[PDB]
Amino acid sequence: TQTMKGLDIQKVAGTWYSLAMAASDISLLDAQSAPARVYVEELKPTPEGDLEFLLQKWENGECAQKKIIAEKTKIPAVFKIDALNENKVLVLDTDYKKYLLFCFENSQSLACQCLVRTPEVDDEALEKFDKALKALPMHIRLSFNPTQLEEQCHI
Amino acid sequence: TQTMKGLDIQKVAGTWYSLAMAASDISLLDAQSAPARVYVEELKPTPEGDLEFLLQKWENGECAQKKIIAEKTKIPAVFKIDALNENKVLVLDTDYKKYLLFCFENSQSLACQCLVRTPEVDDEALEKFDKALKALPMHIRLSFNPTQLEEQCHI
Numbered sequence: 001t002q003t004m005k006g007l008d009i010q011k012v013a014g015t016w017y018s019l020a021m022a023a024s025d026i027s028l029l030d031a032q033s034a035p036a037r038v039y040v041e042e043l044k045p046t047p048e049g050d051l052e053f054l055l056q057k058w059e060n061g062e063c064a065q066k067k068i069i070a071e072k073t074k075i076p077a078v079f080k081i082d083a084l085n086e087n088k089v090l091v092l093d094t095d096y097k098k099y100l101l102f103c104f105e106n107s108q109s110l111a112c113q114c115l116v117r118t119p120e121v122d123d124e125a126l127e128k129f130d131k132a133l134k135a136l137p138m139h140i141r142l143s144f145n146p147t148q149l150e151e152q153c154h155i
Numbered sequence: 156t157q158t159m160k161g162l163d164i165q166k167v168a169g170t171w172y173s174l175a176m177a178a179s180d181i182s183l184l185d186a187q188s189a190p191a192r193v194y195v196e197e198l199k200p201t202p203e204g205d206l207e208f209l210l211q212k213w214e215n216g217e218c219a220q221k222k223i224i225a226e227k228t229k230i231p232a233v234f235k236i237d238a239l240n241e242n243k244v245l246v247l248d249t250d251y252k253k254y255l256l257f258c259f260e261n262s263q264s265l266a267c268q269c270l271v272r273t274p275e276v277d278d279e280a281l282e283k284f285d286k287a288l289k290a291l292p293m294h295i296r297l298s299f300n301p302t303q304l305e306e307q308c309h310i
């Protein structure tokens with residue numbers, strides 16, 4: 001939809017925090033176990049330029065660990081998930097050292113996140129997140145406080 | 156917190172739609188039966204200047220009807236609910252004919268709504284809602300589409 005020009009994927013490696021989330025549909029986020037309520041722990045680019053995500057997900061009554069690889073495409077900012085469905089991960093913007101904005105898109109519904117490196121509310125990153133979101137048909141948004149950011153599944 | 160100057164309460168009577176909702180805590184809105192997921196049907200000012208609300212609420216697996224009176228205070232924009240808890244309704248802004256912004260506050264947690272007269276997405280009213288919200292510690296926001304606005308409990 002809107003993407004990071006000149007993305008250097010190797011430089012997104014490491015720790016991240018899902019500071020804020022937004023989605024096209026309320027049901028994607030408005031339950032503790034909602035489909036898009038997915039918490040990023042780490043991004044692990046592969047030497048071949050795929051992007052592995054370490055995630056948490058509340059499911060069947062607890063906070064489960066998940067590990068998913070999004071495969072590279074010819075566009076550096078766009079990755080594809082191997083599944084029954086054809087979903088994409090799009091990297092909208094990042095400065096590598098503080099924030100990264102991305103969206104998960106199907107083939108439609110959209111969930112986006114504002115990721116930050118540290119458990120702090122970064123108003124500048126959130127401002128960039130909101131600017132990105134005005135071009136998208138979002139209907140739910142939420143953000144987490146520093147206490148929650150240090151808990152499993154942001155409880 | 157922030158209020159409508161010169162509110163004429165009699166002029167808020169009639170049909171309204173909860174176009175958007177925001178709250179201080181994610182748990183107040185992030186479930187179909189969450190405490191602040193309350194849908195406004197009608198406002199009925201009394202001759203004595205109290206404000207009755209006709210509402211819907213998803214509870215015990217369906218969309219229940221609710222009727223609550225908020226009693227006047229010496230401030231025209233602030234009403235008080237008779238309960239074990241001391242909660243207030245604050246009217247932030249309205250033009251009577253298109254939109255009304257209000258907040259429910261306890262003694263703390265806050266839920267606010269953008270009400271509109273018709274089942275339409277009013278970007279100007281939502282812009283006013285967002286401006287009001289930047290002065291408040293909100294962590295979840297959602298908005299409804301015209302199809303949902305015509306359904307019981309916005310399903």
Ligand SMILES: CN(C)CCCN1c2ccccc2Sc2ccc(Cl)cc21
Pocket residue numbers: 028035036037038039053055057066067068070081089104110111112
């Ligand atoms: C259940 N899980 C194993 C799948 C996670 C899918 N998923 C996802 C995929 C690849 C990289 C990052 C993410 S976060 C995310 C946020 C919103 C939505 Cl809707 C989906 C995702």
Ligand SMILES: CN(C)CCCN1c2ccccc2Sc2ccc(Cl)cc21
Pocket residue numbers: 183190191192193194208210212221222223225236244259265266267
């Ligand atoms: C269960 N129900 C009978 C009580 C509704 C209480 N409540 C409320 C009260 C008076 C006038 C309007 C409202 S809407 C609302 C929005 C958010 C929250 Cl948190 C509370 C309320």
Ligand SMILES: [Cl-]
Pocket residue numbers: 022023133138139140141296
């Ligand atoms: Cl939104």
Ligand SMILES: [Cl-]
Pocket residue numbers: 141177178288293294295296
């Ligand atoms: Cl918000």
